[PDB]
Amino acid sequence: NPYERGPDPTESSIEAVRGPFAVAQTTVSRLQADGFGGGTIYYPTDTSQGTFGAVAISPGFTAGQESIAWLGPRIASQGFVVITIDTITRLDQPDSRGRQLQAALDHLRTNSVVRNRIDPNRMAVMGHSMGGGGALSAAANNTSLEAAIPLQGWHTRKNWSSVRTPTLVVGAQLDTIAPVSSHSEAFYNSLPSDLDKAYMELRGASHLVSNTPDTTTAKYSIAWLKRFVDDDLRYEQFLCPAPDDFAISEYRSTCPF
């Protein structure tokens, strides 16, 4: 597998606050960003194993990058180029956030610091709340995306039958802002039956669970991105069959992938 990066994984490795790749960062100004509000790019400094897949992450309604910043280096240190974005306005709705995520991914191919560190065929989108609805919107607009991970996603669009991207839907059991019954689980149910997809509900969690480090969110996001952005079979073991972590109150999937 030419996209395999890093040593063979374990539970400890996917839980790591920092994986083996040392991470640096660079800024995209608001004016440099066409179609989004700027962002921070986190990237592995080690180029000796080849190029990396790229991930764009959107915050939710009223939020800046500070609510998603922890994901940037935590994911990048597993071997990914990750951009955490600011939106055009903090009031932007999910469809617009989806366009902004795509614009951020397109920007990485032009950025002088990271354009030669990225494999242009291996990209993914993630987001919190309205940014998670944006991740689903971006996947619906671009069927070549390799992974989509909405965290406590919110969207008025409930039908995702046009998505062709492997999608991990992360819900919070006690979310009152984006209740799983009408948001996260509804999205899972309308994604195609023939898609590689999973729904992971975090026990006892509120809508804000993604705003500060959460090991369960990180470890399964990392395993999902490794499996689908890197085609890394070594990570299938964490996704299929259902993980038994106490922090997970429900897991649904189309395993085996």
Catalytic residue selected from 86, 92, 95, 175: 175
Cα-based torsion angle of the residue sequence 20, 21, 24, 25 in order, rounded to the nearest 10 degrees: -100
Residue among 56, 61, 166 nearest 111 (CA):
56
Q: Is 1 exposed, middle or buried (0-12, 13-18, 19+ CB in 10 A)?
A: exposed
Catalytic residue among 58, 67, 77, 129: 129
CB distance 90 to 116 below 8 Å? no
Q: Is the bond into 73 cis (omega within 30 degrees of 0)?
A: no
In angstroms, rounded to a whole number, what is the distance separating the alpha carbons of residues 72 and 49? 20
Listing DSSP states for 22-60 in one string gives -EEEEEE-TTT-SSS--EEEEEES--TT--EEEEEEE--
Q: Which of 58, 207, 210, 253 is catalytic?
A: 207
Spans of all domains in the chain: 1-257
Check if 183 is active-site.
Answer: no
3-state secondary structure of 67: helix
Q: How were these coordinates obtained? A: X-ray
Name the helix (H) or strand (E) containing 252.
Answer: strand 248-253
Is 175 annotated in the active site? yes
Rg (CA), the chain: 16
In sequence order, what are the beta bridge partners of 39? 28, 85
How far is the CA of 8 from the CAs of 57, 66, 92, 161, 235, in angstroms?
26, 31, 40, 35, 9
Q: Residue 207 and residue 176: Cα distance in Å, rounded?
A: 7
Q: Is 214 a catalytic residue?
A: no
What is the distance between the alpha carbons of residues 123 and 56, in angstroms, rounded to a whole number? 8
CA distance 167 to 146: 9
- Residue that is written with structure tokens 């071997």 in the block: 79
- Cα 93 to the center of its chain, rounded Å: 18
